Amino acid sequence: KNTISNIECVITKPDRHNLITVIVETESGVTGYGCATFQQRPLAVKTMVDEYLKPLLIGKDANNIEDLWQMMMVNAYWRNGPVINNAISGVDMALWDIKAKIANMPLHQLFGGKSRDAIQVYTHATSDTMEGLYEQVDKYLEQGYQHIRCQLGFYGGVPENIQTAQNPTQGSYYDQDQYIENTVEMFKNLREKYGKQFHILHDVHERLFPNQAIQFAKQIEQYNPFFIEDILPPSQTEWLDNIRNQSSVSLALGELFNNPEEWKALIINRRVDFIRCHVSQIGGITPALKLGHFCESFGVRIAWHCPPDMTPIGAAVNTHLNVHLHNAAIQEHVEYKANTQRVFPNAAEPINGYLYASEIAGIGVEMDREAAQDFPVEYRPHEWTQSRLPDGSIHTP
Amino acid sequence: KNTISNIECVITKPDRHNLITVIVETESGVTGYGCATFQQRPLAVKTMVDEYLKPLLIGKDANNIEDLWQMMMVNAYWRNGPVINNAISGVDMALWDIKAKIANMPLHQLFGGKSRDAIQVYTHATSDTMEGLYEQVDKYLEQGYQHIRCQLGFYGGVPENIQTAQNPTQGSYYDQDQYIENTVEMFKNLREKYGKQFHILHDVHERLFPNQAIQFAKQIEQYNPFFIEDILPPSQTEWLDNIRNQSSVSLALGELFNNPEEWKALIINRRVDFIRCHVSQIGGITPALKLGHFCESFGVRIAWHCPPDMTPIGAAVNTHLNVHLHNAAIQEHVEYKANTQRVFPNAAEPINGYLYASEIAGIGVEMDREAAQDFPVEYRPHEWTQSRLPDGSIHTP
Amino acid sequence: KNTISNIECVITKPDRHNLITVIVETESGVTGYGCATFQQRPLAVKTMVDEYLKPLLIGKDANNIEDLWQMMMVNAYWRNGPVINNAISGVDMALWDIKAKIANMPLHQLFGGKSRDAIQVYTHATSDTMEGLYEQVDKYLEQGYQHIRCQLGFYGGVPENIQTAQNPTQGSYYDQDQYIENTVEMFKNLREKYGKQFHILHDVHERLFPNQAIQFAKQIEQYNPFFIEDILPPSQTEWLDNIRNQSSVSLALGELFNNPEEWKALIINRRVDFIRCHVSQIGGITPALKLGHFCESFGVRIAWHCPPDMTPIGAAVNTHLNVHLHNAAIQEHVEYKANTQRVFPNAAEPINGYLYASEIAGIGVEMDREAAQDFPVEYRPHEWTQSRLPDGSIHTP
Amino acid sequence: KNTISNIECVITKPDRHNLITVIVETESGVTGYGCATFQQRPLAVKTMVDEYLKPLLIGKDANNIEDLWQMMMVNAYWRNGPVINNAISGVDMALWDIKAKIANMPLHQLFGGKSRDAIQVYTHATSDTMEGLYEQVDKYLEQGYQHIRCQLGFYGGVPENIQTAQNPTQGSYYDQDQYIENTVEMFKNLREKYGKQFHILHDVHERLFPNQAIQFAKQIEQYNPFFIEDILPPSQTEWLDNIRNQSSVSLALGELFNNPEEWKALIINRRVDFIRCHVSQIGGITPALKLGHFCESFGVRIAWHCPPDMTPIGAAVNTHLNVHLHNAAIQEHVEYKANTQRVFPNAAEPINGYLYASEIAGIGVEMDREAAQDFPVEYRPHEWTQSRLPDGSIHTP
Amino acid sequence: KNTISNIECVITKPDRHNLITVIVETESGVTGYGCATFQQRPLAVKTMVDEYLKPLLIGKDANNIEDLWQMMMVNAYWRNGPVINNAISGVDMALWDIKAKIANMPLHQLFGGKSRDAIQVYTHATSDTMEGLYEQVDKYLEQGYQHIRCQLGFYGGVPENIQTAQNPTQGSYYDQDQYIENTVEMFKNLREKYGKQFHILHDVHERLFPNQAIQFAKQIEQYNPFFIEDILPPSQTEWLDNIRNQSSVSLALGELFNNPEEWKALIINRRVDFIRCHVSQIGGITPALKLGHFCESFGVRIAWHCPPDMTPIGAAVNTHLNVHLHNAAIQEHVEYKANTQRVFPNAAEPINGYLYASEIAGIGVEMDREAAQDFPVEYRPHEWTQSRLPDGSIHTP
Ligand SMILES: [Cl-]
Ligand SMILES: [Cl-]
Ligand SMILES: [Cl-]
Ligand SMILES: [Cl-]
Ligand SMILES: [Cl-]
Ligand SMILES: [Cl-]
Ligand SMILES: [Cl-]
Ligand SMILES: [Mg+2]
Ligand SMILES: [Mg+2]
Ligand SMILES: [Mg+2]
Ligand SMILES: [Mg+2]
Ligand SMILES: [Mg+2]
Ligand SMILES: [Mg+2]
């Protein structure tokens, strides 16, 4: 047995985002690290770990990750959701980290090994002008990326060019029709300039109503996007049947998921082509493996959410999952800055459009705890989540 | 308790339509006003209120709108339908008016308050020529409207350019193919001239057979109408699945509904994008709130029917519902003439494409009883409802 | 407008449970109180309110509850789940409390009034012997209760009479077959002694596997329980189809729900007869009203979860919902003790099997903030949630 | 890398069945052992390993079990089926053995560790009389078993009490009605004598036509069998819907499966409560983990086939899977005789109704190569598979 | 009775492929020949026949083909799959040959005679250039073929112009996008040059993911291919519904099938227009007839797989089945080489686009036993089955 001797939760903001790490110490002296990053509510996740998971977990056998996951998930009776799941994810990843270290193996080797040499990577280009897009796309192409998520225009902030009511309620405003029009124009221009040079992805980020999504699918399907992401919010994915029945568009969805009821009908009915779950939002590696296998039976492929608001520990974990799970398709990546790299040393970066899994024992990335102390948590409003349509209505952000 | 002391029903015809208002007096001294407008059969609604609802309601507690509504709906054993529901609606709306006045709140604040600053508005442009259309559209755009329901041609009357049988039966004649041809051409012409300057709506008004409706949807989907309204009659909406499976066209339906069985399967199967119910036809505010909530769970949005054959009291009520219900989308424009404005003082008018909810206590619009007496009920035959196809057969009007 | 001036969150444990109250102060000087009680993780809910909802909400208009609810729900981007929802519920209830106070009306009158005189109530009898059950049942019957949830045996703790593995993992042990056998025997004995004197309810509390649930339904259906509650866990309710296809048993489910995807298919497919949601777990009054209306269209009735781990504020709120919503069926009740009554004065208690809604302005129950300070939060392990079957497996608790 | 240096396949018959072991040697010096037992066609599996899998695998990296499995499955283009899957299983299991040995962990710890302390076990009682049954049951109960699979009568052989045609075709005869009659009587008798003392299982072994299966389910459901196994053959499992819609009987199925199309719709439609796959028939540990996860999402539990025609290596593997997979339920008992114990040293035996996973590195059971050579393959005709009904027609055996 | 006196299995490789023939001798002195060709695993098939089917079959009555098939199929208990089915097929075909020889009739006359004069034939044109394709196409049209399966490019081998990971794992590489692009261009060019001169077929050979298949279907439907073959792998055919709901493309699938669960739902749901099964893979003539009839009821037509890896005996059998079964559509043919013709004399060749059934007694084609000895089995690694995507992942080959 390997008895858990401590549980710690650290919030660090080396750069733009409040990142959250969980650290598990064991009587073997082997230490694990995991990602619990829910950037919008980090103090809630920390409270959850410090006040509840810690006294629950100290004294228990770290070897039995599966029991610990099943036990943790139901421990508050009420369950699922972002605060509990991220806290559990932090522990779950750290426990797998310890197991891999004790096995003296890279994490993906514990799983049963590689099913691919490395995972393909897509990056992000966003500009308010086509010329600006071209500038970023050109750089990415020169670096060997073959997949780029492109966006024309920025959506939010003050309603400068939007016909609102007289005294619009405070919020981040956009117009769905302007957004649709700019996006179609973007695809048309990118295909005219670049042809089939690279794969174009685009993130709808739940901006649209169902009728707008169906129209939009028919408008861009001719451009064969690698995928169109979050074309609807999680609560309206039954409307995907309307799209799947009449459009060939490739669809990805699910970074928002933190309850299994959100994805089961989605996958069984083949409503998307790629699942986009944020691994820490679904409770860590343990459920990620199961969900990977579930998708596989239905022919659904995997593109785990990999935003900047996630530790490099979490990213390395996703790369281990991505080189192992046969139905993994692509990894999202954004560049790390120097502070982040200092707090989380040895974070892999894409090489010629590929991310390579770590080959040392464990996850392969840890947190430098002294460095992390230099960057304490900092309150952020996240004003973009107060997203409003011209009439002042809230829309899923 | 707030005991009901009197119930009255007034039919008034300030301008082109017979309007119906129910007036509820209480022992608190607070009076409520409601819309019961079924313009085609007004004496029947008045008989229903005066002879049956009045002796039922006098003496009962106006506070308990929900009990009174559930009780009223089943009071005749047989139920649903346009005459009973309209009479009940008049009472139901007046009871809400009373409750809001006693609470000293605008009606929408009772409901739980605003979910938007104001509701967007669409107006109506109809002409026998394109230039006549352009004339009306230019005027509306200049007034700030962003949504216009357009129709080229008038359909009905003597069969002048229509090959009928030798001695055609008396009726109001049209040719469905001429109607389709003109409407497709109209859409084409408007997009050429105006591009994406405004949202174009069109009301099919149940003119078509299902195969025609399906053909029409494929013919106009490319023009992205904001919605195509009543593309089928209420009894044939299962045919919408054929449309939904192969077309992206945005659909609205339901102004004719007066029985819940007409809408449940519609909404459950996502057969339309907007519900168009006439609030008084479904029994008033009480069922309108439930239906709005019902639609919201399925992702269906709301565009309550707001024709000229409705009191300004009913319009105000609809704007109260529209600024409250989160899934409300748009409100139909009704320009009020001098006589109607005198009978129903303080009726809101759109300002720069928006209708604003009233902010005084209650509904915010009452009927001037003296002014209404000046304009008594007048029989109208509504010949357009005897709608006939070229072979002389009735079609749903 | 009524600007929010403060937001406070208090945890108090006057008796057995950590209760959580949210208090909203406004520039009008009118103060609201709401329930945010997630007893197993109270510090997490408090963190959520103090650190996040408070700076978000101060300065905003308390009148617009609907916008504030829609805005709050999506404010962390990721959403749903027990920690966020309870925090939002606390604010939502307090906002309705303020609106009712300003309207000078009892909460249920804001909603549209009563649809019943009072709500029927069921209470709880639990013993390890039939004789002990009879003793409690006899008292309840004498007090006028007509509905009693009965349980024979206590399930959990050390595996004294259970054949486990040699060195069973620490946990709370029970045997599903012993539990089934005791429960069937209980119903058989109660019907033999009491006949149809009262309505018997029973809470399966997700103890069973699907095959056991189906067997159990067929075993007790002859006893016509008023309902059998939580016969399956939330993740396995599709298995209810097997039961609904072959058994007449009345079913209730849903106290665990905190994501709408958990209940939509459940209700649309008529898989249960009563919905059991914990109002604070689903985000407060605002979504409770909508869910009430949703259920109503499908003929599903309401029995909101009313456990001891909920403030009397929350209970009074449920009674307001129960006398208003036409499809409300029954209210669960457990007696308050003197400390709890001191901290939450004027809490209604059942009278002859009925709970009467409060008739003063507002919710009708507040928290005495000095009294609450006498009873600070106290860590509880809740060892019963580590529920294990004889082989040491975790089972949903 | 850990390069494969040799692949061997040994058929050994220590006792009643031809057993098949695959042995994988690597350059690390670490040797793996796996089960490839298809007892009816052992020379075919050995040809498959020796002639095709050996030259394919030598030189490749044993670490990457997942790639090797995906590659092996499609290597012959045509795929699935009992000969190929068993050969692949032998390799797959040996590769997992190797990985666990290198990690210096018991196999189940690699997977993520335990979710139960040990797995419950059922044994088998079969006799031509009830008293003979009682004899075996009494012995098993006294040994600590709580689950016994019971069968009254032996079915097959010469048609002694069976009205066949004049000159019946050579085969193993039985009468389905005699079988049903004896089994119903057996259940009745066991419940009268033993009541609820133990769980009774029964294996129908695809003996019945669908109308017989449905009749039988209704006849024995009252006796609450722990499961009724293989009530239909694999090709007729859609007939299970008729059973599921009207009966509570608990069902197990799937020992015959060797193609995923055989189980997907089964599990998706909840047609059984327990999956019974033979791990080597589905291709080894790698697909067994995925299938367990797949079943878990649908609430289906696992009872892998553990017959005597399987190596103790395969049994140990199944116990490793059974203590890991949370939805594992029970393991079939196989008493090992002296010769088999010598060939496969250290095979676990049930202790008080439980099988405990091995705790040394690797699978924990190997084959003694010298001992196995003592017991070479011996042809068996397995006459029972020529199973005939009274009219002389083949029925699935 | 016609007692089986011997069973033999000969592997012969006169040209590029290991071919497998089963020979059945009877006491009548009449000898039958059948195809058991599974070219990738021939030694496993031969073991199956020699070690198991032979001692099973000798002594039994060859007259009763139906019983012999039902008996053979379940004789190993576990069943279906390519090794067992091919062995059984060789026997089944030889028995049908024997029966037809005894009746002194061509095989298809046994079945009930011709339903057509002859079967239309398609050939294969494949090249890395369009002009290379044109030469082959031109050759075929001159010979009277009216159907040609066309392929531009060769896919596999070393990843020369493919961006792989740094050290790509050994395998046969292709890029799906490159393949789709070339194939779409091929269709475009062929229709430009040839118009509707001939029917163009194309074999996707399970190279694509579902989202790619759906895109491809929409890209080529305008070119009206006679059929697009194997657009998905057998385990993913439920994705065909997405294609069938939005595309008019003609589809064929099934050469991989060796388990009826692979085809039933496929055909019941009309997911393909042509079934493509390999007759020996499904177990011979006996199940080919039933499957032909099953398809016919559903309106599905037959294009049995007729690759070079099949004996001319098996090809003759397919022509007998094709002139008999009313729903047979077309026969694939590859030109025979001289050594193959020597070993299997008198094999029919297409004449002006038609294949004519043999008119002598029996199948019409036998194996020259002495000639076959000149060409013993030779190992081949079939490296193309290790098909990898650019990232190193195995894809179904
Ligand atoms: Cl921010
Ligand atoms: Cl808007
Ligand atoms: Cl008129
Ligand atoms: Cl406790
Ligand atoms: Cl157990
Ligand atoms: Cl035998
Ligand atoms: Cl096989
Ligand atoms: Mg995204
Ligand atoms: Mg209309
Ligand atoms: Mg409960
Ligand atoms: Mg069995
Ligand atoms: Mg092919
Ligand atoms: Mg379609």
From Swiss-Prot, chains A, B, C, D, E:
Keywords for the protein's UniProt record, in alphabetical order: Magnesium, Metal-binding
Pfam families: MR_MLE_C (PF13378), MR_MLE_N (PF02746)
BP-aspect Gene Ontology terms: amino acid catabolic process
Sequence positions that bind Mg(2+): 203, 229, 255
Ranges annotated as spanning the membrane: none
Function noted in UniProt: Has no detectable activity with D-mannonate and with a panel of 70 other acid sugars (in vitro), in spite of the conservation of the residues that are expected to be important for catalytic activity and cofactor binding. May have evolved a divergent function.
Quaternary structure annotation from Swiss-Prot or TrEMBL: Homotetramer.
The protein's name in its UniProt record: D-galactonate dehydratase family member VME_00770
Species of the source: Vibrio harveyi (strain 1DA3)
